[PDB]
Design an enzyme around this catalytic site. Sequence first.
Site, PDB file in Angstrom:
ATOM      1  N   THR A 231       0.334   5.030 -13.257  1.00  6.21           N
ATOM      2  CA  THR A 231       1.482   5.797 -12.875  1.00  6.21           C
ATOM      3  C   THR A 231       1.643   6.372 -11.762  1.00  6.21           C
ATOM      4  O   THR A 231       3.227   6.230 -11.385  1.00  6.21           O
ATOM      5  CB  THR A 231       1.147   7.297 -13.811  1.00  6.21           C
ATOM      6  OG1 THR A 231       1.511   7.071 -15.225  1.00  6.21           O
ATOM      7  CG2 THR A 231       2.013   8.407 -13.277  1.00  6.21           C
TER       8      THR A 231
ATOM      9  N   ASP B  60       6.796   4.122 -16.799  1.00  9.25           N
ATOM     10  CA  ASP B  60       5.770   3.381 -15.708  1.00  9.25           C
ATOM     11  C   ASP B  60       4.953   1.923 -16.265  1.00  9.25           C
ATOM     12  O   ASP B  60       4.756   1.501 -15.657  1.00  9.25           O
ATOM     13  CB  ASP B  60       5.904   4.546 -15.462  1.00  9.25           C
ATOM     14  CG  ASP B  60       4.328   5.293 -16.098  1.00  9.25           C
ATOM     15  OD1 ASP B  60       4.414   5.309 -17.461  1.00  9.25           O
ATOM     16  OD2 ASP B  60       3.221   6.380 -15.832  1.00  9.25           O
TER      17      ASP B  60
ATOM     18  N   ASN C  80      -1.992 -13.558   7.760  1.00 10.58           N
ATOM     19  CA  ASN C  80      -1.547 -11.746   6.982  1.00 10.58           C
ATOM     20  C   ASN C  80      -1.569 -11.214   6.315  1.00 10.58           C
ATOM     21  O   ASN C  80      -1.421 -10.467   5.586  1.00 10.58           O
ATOM     22  CB  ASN C  80      -1.219 -11.376   8.620  1.00 10.58           C
ATOM     23  CG  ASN C  80       0.097 -11.646   8.391  1.00 10.58           C
ATOM     24  OD1 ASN C  80       0.967 -12.183   7.724  1.00 10.58           O
ATOM     25  ND2 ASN C  80       1.318 -11.054   9.751  1.00 10.58           N
TER      26      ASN C  80
ATOM     27  N   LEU D 127       5.086 -12.281   3.543  1.00  9.61           N
ATOM     28  CA  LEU D 127       6.019 -13.074   4.434  1.00  9.61           C
ATOM     29  C   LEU D 127       6.019 -14.439   5.474  1.00  9.61           C
ATOM     30  O   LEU D 127       4.376 -14.435   5.549  1.00  9.61           O
ATOM     31  CB  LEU D 127       6.645 -12.541   5.705  1.00  9.61           C
ATOM     32  CG  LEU D 127       6.976 -10.926   4.880  1.00  9.61           C
ATOM     33  CD1 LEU D 127       7.172  -9.900   6.025  1.00  9.61           C
ATOM     34  CD2 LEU D 127       7.636 -10.708   4.019  1.00  9.61           C
TER      35      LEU D 127
HETATM   36  C1  LIG Z   1       9.476  -5.079   0.994  1.00  4.57           C
HETATM   37  O1  LIG Z   1      10.210  -4.274   1.255  1.00  4.57           O
HETATM   38  C2  LIG Z   1      10.111  -3.545   2.904  1.00  4.57           C
HETATM   39  C3  LIG Z   1      10.749  -2.635   3.084  1.00  4.57           C
HETATM   40  O2  LIG Z   1      11.566  -3.485   3.868  1.00  4.57           O
HETATM   41  C4  LIG Z   1       9.185  -4.325   4.048  1.00  4.57           C
HETATM   42  O3  LIG Z   1       8.440  -4.159   4.904  1.00  4.57           O
HETATM   43  C5  LIG Z   1       9.304  -4.021   6.649  1.00  4.57           C
HETATM   44  O4  LIG Z   1       9.027  -5.456   6.357  1.00  4.57           O
HETATM   45  C6  LIG Z   1       9.746  -5.501   8.132  1.00  4.57           C
HETATM   46  C7  LIG Z   1       8.968  -6.624   8.469  1.00  4.57           C
HETATM   47  O5  LIG Z   1       7.964  -7.062   8.935  1.00  4.57           O
HETATM   48  C8  LIG Z   1       9.080  -4.627   8.974  1.00  4.57           C
HETATM   49  O6  LIG Z   1      10.019  -4.288  10.572  1.00  4.57           O
HETATM   50  C9  LIG Z   1       9.520  -4.496  11.742  1.00  4.57           C
HETATM   51  O7  LIG Z   1      10.208  -3.975  11.988  1.00  4.57           O
HETATM   52  C10 LIG Z   1       9.782  -3.989  13.916  1.00  4.57           C
HETATM   53  C11 LIG Z   1      10.454  -2.843  14.416  1.00  4.57           C
HETATM   54  O8  LIG Z   1      10.728  -1.589  13.770  1.00  4.57           O
HETATM   55  C12 LIG Z   1       9.886  -5.713  14.496  1.00  4.57           C
HETATM   56  O9  LIG Z   1       8.246  -5.527  14.605  1.00  4.57           O
HETATM   57  C13 LIG Z   1      10.488  -6.348  13.161  1.00  4.57           C
HETATM   58  O10 LIG Z   1      10.941  -7.423  13.543  1.00  4.57           O
HETATM   59  C14 LIG Z   1      11.011  -5.517  12.007  1.00  4.57           C
HETATM   60  O11 LIG Z   1      12.022  -5.250  11.897  1.00  4.57           O
HETATM   61  C15 LIG Z   1       9.020  -3.361   8.271  1.00  4.57           C
HETATM   62  O12 LIG Z   1       8.182  -2.241   8.989  1.00  4.57           O
HETATM   63  C16 LIG Z   1       9.015  -3.068   6.501  1.00  4.57           C
HETATM   64  N1  LIG Z   1       9.319  -1.608   6.544  1.00  4.57           N
HETATM   65  C17 LIG Z   1       8.231  -1.031   5.390  1.00  4.57           C
HETATM   66  C18 LIG Z   1       8.891  -0.177   4.749  1.00  4.57           C
HETATM   67  O13 LIG Z   1       7.557  -0.741   5.331  1.00  4.57           O
HETATM   68  C19 LIG Z   1       8.340  -5.971   2.952  1.00  4.57           C
HETATM   69  O14 LIG Z   1       7.994  -7.122   4.132  1.00  4.57           O
HETATM   70  C20 LIG Z   1       8.827  -6.196   2.054  1.00  4.57           C
HETATM   71  N2  LIG Z   1       7.967  -6.997   1.050  1.00  4.57           N
HETATM   72  C21 LIG Z   1       8.119  -8.123   0.488  1.00  4.57           C
HETATM   73  C22 LIG Z   1       6.379  -9.159   0.417  1.00  4.57           C
HETATM   74  O15 LIG Z   1       8.749  -8.853   0.373  1.00  4.57           O
HETATM   75 CA    CA Z   2       2.255 -13.621   7.095  1.00  6.33          CA
HETATM   76 ZN    ZN Z   3       1.354   6.717 -16.373  1.00  2.76          ZN
END
Ligand SMILES: *[C@@H]1O[C@H](CO)[C@@H](O[C@@H]2O[C@H](CO)[C@@H](O[C@@H]3O[C@H](CO)[C@@H](O)[C@H](O)[C@@H]3O)[C@H](O)[C@H]2NC(C)=O)[C@H](O)[C@H]1NC(C)=O
Ligand code: CA
Ligand code: ZN
Length: 783
Positions: A154, A303, A665, A669
Site C-alpha cells: 500500500t 493499489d 549505476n 538510465l
Molecule cells: C523517473 O522520473 C524521475 C523524475 O523525472 C527521474 O529522476 C530524475 O533523474 C534526473 C536525471 O538523473 C535528475 O536530474 C538531474 O539533475 C541534476 C541537476 O540538478 C543534473 O546532475 C542532471 O543533468 C539532471 O538534471 C533528477 O534528480 C531526478 N528527479 C527525481 C525526482 O528523482 C528518473 O530518472 C526516472 N526514472 C527512470 C528509470 O526513467
Molecule cells: Ca545508468
Molecule cells: Zn493495501
Amino acid sequence: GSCKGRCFELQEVGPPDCRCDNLCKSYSSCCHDFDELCLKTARGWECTKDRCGEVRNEENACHCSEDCLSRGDCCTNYQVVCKGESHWVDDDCEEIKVPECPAGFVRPPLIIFSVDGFRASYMKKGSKVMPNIEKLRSCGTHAPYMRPVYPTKTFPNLYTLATGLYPESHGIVGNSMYDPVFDASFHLRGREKFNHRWWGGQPLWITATKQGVRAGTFFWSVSIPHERRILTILQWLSLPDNERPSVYAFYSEQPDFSGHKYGPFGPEMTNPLREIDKTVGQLMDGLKQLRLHRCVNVIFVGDHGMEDVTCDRTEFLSNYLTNVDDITLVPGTLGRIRAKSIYDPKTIIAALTCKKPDQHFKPYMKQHLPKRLHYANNRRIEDIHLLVDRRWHVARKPCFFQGDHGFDNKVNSMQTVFVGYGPTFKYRTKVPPFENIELYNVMCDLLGLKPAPNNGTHGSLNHLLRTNTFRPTMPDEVSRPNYPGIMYLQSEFDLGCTCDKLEELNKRLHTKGSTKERHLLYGRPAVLYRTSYDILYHTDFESGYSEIFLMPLWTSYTISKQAEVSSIPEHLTNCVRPDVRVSPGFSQNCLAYKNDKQMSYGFLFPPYLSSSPEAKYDAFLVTNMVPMYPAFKRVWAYFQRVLVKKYASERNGVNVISGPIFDYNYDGLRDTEDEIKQYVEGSSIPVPTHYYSIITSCLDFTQPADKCDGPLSVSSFILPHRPDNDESCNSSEDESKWVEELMKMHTARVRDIEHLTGLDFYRKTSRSYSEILTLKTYLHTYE
Ligand SMILES: *[C@@H]1O[C@H](CO)[C@@H](O[C@@H]2O[C@H](CO)[C@@H](O[C@@H]3O[C@H](CO)[C@@H](O)[C@H](O)[C@@H]3O)[C@H](O)[C@H]2NC(C)=O)[C@H](O)[C@H]1NC(C)=O
Ligand SMILES: [Ca+2]
Ligand SMILES: [Zn+2]
Ligand SMILES: [Zn+2]
C-alpha cells in the site's frame, strides 16, 4: 479550544493549538470535544420517512432538515426518501458530452476513490454484488486491470499514484524501511512516517497548490467511519467558491483487511465488497443531490491485489543460513536483508541460491533484479533482495491470516482496478491494461495542471479521455548518423582476427538498396544524446554502429514465417571479418578476447538466420560482434538459433531490434562513458550489463510483419549479462528447459529500453504518436 463550527476544517491549526481536521486523531491532538462533536453516530447514515423535515438536532450523524444543503450535511439518501428523487444507480447511463456544472464551479472537480487491496477479478462479481461500481465501470472508461508498482504494498503504491514516480525515485520503497543517512526506520505504525524527510517527488496535492488549485485533505484517520469521510467530501464541495477544493481523495481500508483474513476467494469477501459498493452509491447519491453527478470526474482505483497465502507456506532463513542472528530481514511476500550491525553479502547470496528442489524464493543483488521492477536506485533498498514465489512468505526464524500481497507486480493476483467516470472520460469505453505510474499525468490533465517530472509517459493515456489538454510530440534526434562507404582495404587491418572472391565482383555491396524497406519497418531509431555513429547496411540486417562503444547501439532485422534456420559451419566457427567501412581504430580486436580468460563474444544479427551462404559472411563482421560471457552465450545462442524462428512462426514474421545496455549505476538510465566500470581486458571495449531485443509484428496476424496495415504487436526483453546462470536453477539442463523461462522473467517495455539506451523507436509508422506511446508502454507479462 473547541471543535464547534470547525469539524473537518481545511485550515490546519497549531502546533500546539487543538486541531479539528482529518488527521488530528493520528497525532492524538484533537480538541477535547472532537470525538463528541465531529464523529456523531446517532441514528446512522440514512434518512427515513419519519425524519423528513425534522428540526435540526445537532447530535444526529447526518440531517434530514430543510437547512441541510446549506451545509451539505444531509444524509446522502435525503432527496430519494424525502423529495421523491431516484438513486443514481437506478438511472440509465447518459453520455456526458460536456461538464454540466452548477453556479460557482470554474473547472470539473476530481474525486479519487481509492480502495485498498481490490483485486481486478473482484469486478467479475457483477451487478448483483456491486451495482454502483458496475454502473461506473460500464458507463465510463475502464481497463480490464491496472498494474501496480513493486513491491505490491500500500504505501509504495498510493504514493506512486500521487506522484507518477517509481518507489526508488519517490522514496517510499516499502511499508517498512530503514534509511542509513537518517539512521532511522519507517513503519506503518507510529509517528516516524509523519516526518516529511521520507517523502520525495511532488505529490498531486502539492502540484495543485503550487499552481493555485486548492486540494482537499487526502488522508483520513482510520477512526473516521467511511460514511463520515463521504459526508465530509460533500460538505467541502458545498463551501464557498474561494474555499472549495478542486481535488479530493477518499481512501478505504477494504477489501484489503478481509482479503488478509479470508483470502481473495473466500465467500466472506462478498460482504466487504457489498459495503464498498454501498459507499460508492452514497457518494453518487450525494453528488446527485448537489447537481454534481454530471460535473465531477471520479477515479475508482485500487493499489494492489491479493493472493492466497497461509502460515504453513513459510520458508525460513534459519533453514538456509547458519548465522541468522547476524542479519536483519524485512520479511513476508518479499525479503530484504541487511546486517544487524554495520556477515558477508556474497556468502549470504550463495547460501540462498538453489539449495532445495522446491525452494519458493530466489535471492538477487538488487542490481540483478529484472529491470522492469525499477527497484534498485535508492539507499533505502537493501543490496540483498528475495523475490518470493506467489502464495508464499519468507521469514527469518520459526491460522489467523489467509491472504497477502507484495509479490512481483506482473503476477495475476496482484493486478488491481481502474475506472474513470465523468465528463472528461470517455463513454462506455474499454481500454488496454496500463501501469499505475501513468495516472499522475492524467490527473494533472484533468485539473489543468502541468505535471512535475515523472515516470509516466505523457500522452500514452490520451485514449482514456474525451478531450485532451496535451498532445505529445516526438523528440528531436540529437546525433545524426554517418553513412560511411567501403573506404578502406583488407590489408590495412590487423585486429588479430581470422576467417578462412564474389564480394570483389559485387560493386553494390553494402549499399542501402532494399535493406531499409525490409529490415527497418518502423524507421531508424533516433539517437537522443550526443555521440558519433555509423549506419551499416547488409542483405539481412541493418545496424547503428557506435564509434565510441565499438559496437552497435542497435541491430535491426526481419524474419518471415518461412525463414530457414541453418548451422554455423565448422569452417566458420571462429571466423571474424574486418569491416571495410569502419577504421581499425574504431573497431574491436580479437586479441583482447583471447587475452580475456572470462570473456567471449557473440553476434547481434544471428548467423543462424542468414538468407544465403553468401549473406552469412556478413554476420561475421567485426562490427556485428559484442562481448559475451560464455554462460550468457548459452542463453543468447538459444534465443537466436531457436526462439526467434519460433516467434516468426507464431506471429507471421517478426522484426527484431537487438542491442547492448550499459547501466552500471543501476539508475535505469544510459550510462555515460565515465560510468562504465568494466571493459574487455587490456582494451577499450566496454562490457554491457544487459542485452535487449524488441520483437515486433502485426497485431492482425493474418498479415505478415512486413505488410502490416494497422496496430502493431510487441514483446521485448532486457536480459542481464551475467557470467553464470545461477539465477536459473535448471540451467544444467538443455536450454529448452530454462532459457525461455529466464527471458519471460526479464520481459520489458520498449520505454524501459529507451531510457536505458537513449534511443527512440517507431519514428516512421502509419499510427498516431499517441498510439505509439501506448505501444511503447506495453508489457508482455506471460501471465
Ligand atoms: C523517473 O522520473 C524521475 C523524475 O523525472 C527521474 O529522476 C530524475 O533523474 C534526473 C536525471 O538523473 C535528475 O536530474 C538531474 O539533475 C541534476 C541537476 O540538478 C543534473 O546532475 C542532471 O543533468 C539532471 O538534471 C533528477 O534528480 C531526478 N528527479 C527525481 C525526482 O528523482 C528518473 O530518472 C526516472 N526514472 C527512470 C528509470 O526513467
Ligand atoms: Ca545508468
Ligand atoms: Zn493495501
Ligand atoms: Zn494488505
